[PDB]
Amino acid sequence: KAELKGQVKDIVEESGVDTSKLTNDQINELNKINFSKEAKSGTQLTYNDFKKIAKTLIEQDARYAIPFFNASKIKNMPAAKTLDAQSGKVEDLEIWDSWPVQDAKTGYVSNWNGYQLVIGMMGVPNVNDNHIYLLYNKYGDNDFNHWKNAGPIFGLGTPVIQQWSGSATLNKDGSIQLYYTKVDTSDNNTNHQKLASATVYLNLEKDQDKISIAHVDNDHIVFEGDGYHYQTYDQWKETNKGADNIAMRDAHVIDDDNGNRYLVFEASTGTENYQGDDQIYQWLNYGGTNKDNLGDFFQILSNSDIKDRAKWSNAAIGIIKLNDDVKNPSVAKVYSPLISAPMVSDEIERPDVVKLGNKYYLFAATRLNRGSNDDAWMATNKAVGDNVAMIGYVSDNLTHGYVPLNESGVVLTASVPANWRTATYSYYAVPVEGRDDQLLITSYITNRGEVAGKGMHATWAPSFLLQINPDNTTTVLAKMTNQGDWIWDDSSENPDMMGVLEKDAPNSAALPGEWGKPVDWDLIGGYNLKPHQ
């Protein structure tokens, strides 16, 4: 004869559940719930927030849905026909996660001797070929065909040492301070990630409009996790049963007004709030009404895959302060995570902090299929054929105090199937000079590895404007650029890039053959898509 404890008895009664209808098993589970109110790891993406983000995606609301793109206008990047870091030979690469060289305080795209500079991950489709390359164009030149490739930052290499995403800013002497993810795969092919930095010096040949990589100096590891705030590789190795994610990547540089420099990055929580079975019993993780939470608790416990995922989910967006050695930084201070998703997701990527007015806006990309709630993310695939989102938060202070935008944190939601030419990912907001209430959203378009078809390569998306409202909401605007436009300037707007949800329109969001084509095995691609209203 098991008896409910005091606090949980109140919850059960408030929820309209008849206490005498509970089994001993259910009672014993309920008595394990921890009703602590103290947040251990920053602002959380809760189980309820995740459900709300999925529901908002399914609704395909004009406020949040990624705009439709004119599929017929999308081209592979001409500058991606280039020497491949892993072969030394010219091949047709694809390009995905990319970032501009930008001012550390304002985020504005830097003007380097009349050029704009972008660093991006590129490689041959369906090869494990993860390295970073420098791309350049005249500053304010919106023509996608004009970008040129200066080649791989670190020259030729192999899959043993990889470079994944980060950020970059100029030094006073005109070198680039690059923050990137160094990945070592020598230990049973694990992706052992570390935050690294290097100083990159460029040579300009003016009469050829040609930029080359001249010197790479000070290449070293900045941060690998501390174990308390952020999970280390050794901790991950010790707990893994084969289904735990590892993250220490995507460092985004930002300076405060006093010129202290920080990196904001993707990681997992350490022993401050570690993953595990115990997370299922932390009421704070649920984030709905007491009644909603009670229902969620039983959903998790009764479904083995959701329960498994819940035990391993502990994504975090972290922040560290660097010391003042700009070209050769070390860590000065490690903070608690800004955002975390214990019990909820094991992957939140590409964090991006932008200062607008006197507030800090933090955005991140995520694939909802990395979340614990299989029913929620499976519903997004059924509605749209994809499960990607951008989430966002706002704070008065850089290092703490973030509040979710649009209530749940939702900012952008997938609008087309993952295997269409116009699918996007890796959203990255860039500020716009002279428009302090808007951001330009850049992304890559077409998923990697020929999922949209042979010859359909990941490439730079048309960019679009996002309106930021002072009441902690956002709205997608009907303003769109050429592919690969990182700078919103007087000639950026190109309405021809806009797509429509119509099978045979010349500006259809679908290429011929895509409307109705299977996705996720037998789902009809596009079947449940609706005009954005």
For residue 374 the two structure tokens come to 């299989």
The option from Cl ion, Ca ion, none interacting with 116 (CB < 5 to 8 A, set by class) reads none
Residue 527 is which amino acid? Y
The option from Ca ion, Cl ion, none interacting with 312 (CB < 5 to 8 A, set by class) reads Ca ion
Please provide the DSSP assignment of 515-531 as one string.
TT-EETTTEETTTT---
Nearest distance, CB of residue 310 and Ca ion, angstroms: 10
**Which span (5-13, 153-161, 202-210, 342-350) binds Cl ion, by CB under 5 A?**
153-161
The option from Ca ion, Cl ion, none interacting with 275 (CB < 5 to 8 A, set by class) reads Ca ion
- 133 makes contact with Cl ion (CB under 5 A): no
- Phi then psi for 116, rounded to 5 degrees? -105, 145
Rank residues 132 and 316 by Cβ distance to Cl ion and give the closer one: 132
- 269 makes contact with Ca ion (CB under 5 A): no
- 285 makes contact with Ca ion (CB under 5 A): no
- Residue 263 near residue 322 (C-beta atoms within 8 A): yes
User: Which of 137, 199, 293, 314 touches Ca ion by CB under 5 A?
Assistant: 314
Applying CB under 5 A, what is the total number of residues that bind Ca ion? 5
HEC letters along 309-347: HHHHCCEEEEEEEECCCCCCCCEEEECCCCEECCCCECC
User: How far does the chain reach from its first CA to its final CA, in angstroms?
Assistant: 54
User: Which of 224, 346, 349, 514 touches Ca ion by CB under 5 A?
Assistant: 346
- Residue 180 near residue 164 (C-beta atoms within 8 A): yes
**Which span (19-27, 282-290, 291-299, 344-352) binds Ca ion, by CB under 5 A?**
344-352
Nearest distance, CB of residue 218 and Cl ion, angstroms: 12
User: Which of 154, 286, 402, 460 touches Cl ion by CB under 5 A?
Assistant: 154
Q: Could you tell me which of 55, 48, 10 has the C-alpha nearest to residue 288?
A: 48
- Residue 488 near residue 109 (C-beta atoms within 8 A): no
Contacts of 392 (CB under 8 A, 6+ apart): 361, 362, 363, 364, 404, 405, 406, 409, 410, 411, 474
The option from Cl ion, Ca ion, none interacting with 444 (CB < 5 to 8 A, set by class) reads none
Nearest distance, CB of residue 41 and Ca ion, angstroms: 13
Cα distance between residue 272 and residue 128, in whole Å: 34
Query: What residues between 168 and 207 interact with Cl ion by CB under 5 A?
Result: 182
SS3 445: strand
* Catalytic position from the list 29, 224, 349, 352: 349
The option from Cl ion, Ca ion, none interacting with 179 (CB < 5 to 8 A, set by class) reads none
Cα distance between residue 63 and residue 379, in whole Å: 20
Q: Indicate if 349 belongs to the active site.
A: yes
Rank residues 60 and 163 by Cβ distance to Cl ion and give the closer one: 163
Q: Could you tell me which of 225, 226, 240, 486 has the C-alpha nearest to residue 352?
A: 486
How many beta carbons lie within 10 A of that of residue 171, not counting itself? Answer: 13
Binding residues for substrate are: 96, 165, 249-250, 347-349, 367
For residue 174 the two structure tokens come to 């005109």
Applying CB under 5 A, what is the total number of residues that bind Cl ion? 2
Rank residues 149 and 245 by Cβ distance to Ca ion and give the closer one: 245
Site map 233..262 versus Ca ion, x via CB under 5 A: -----------x------------------
In this chain, which residue has its C-beta nearest to Cl ion?
Answer: 154
Residue 287 is which amino acid? G
The option from Cl ion, Ca ion, none interacting with 244 (CB < 5 to 8 A, set by class) reads Ca ion
Rank residues 155 and 495 by Cβ distance to Cl ion and give the closer one: 155
- Phi then psi for 305, rounded to 5 degrees? -70, -40
Rank residues 253 and 339 by Cβ distance to Cl ion and give the closer one: 253
- Residue 301 near residue 63 (C-beta atoms within 8 A): no
Between CA 487 and CA 496, with CA 490 as vertex, the angle to 5 degrees is 85
Cα distance between residue 63 and residue 53, in whole Å: 13
Q: Indicate if 238 belongs to the active site.
A: no
* Residues within the interface to Ca ion (CB under 5 A): 244, 275, 312, 314, 346
Catalytic residues: 97, 349
**Residues at the site binding Cl ion, with contacts judged by CB under 5 A:** 154, 182
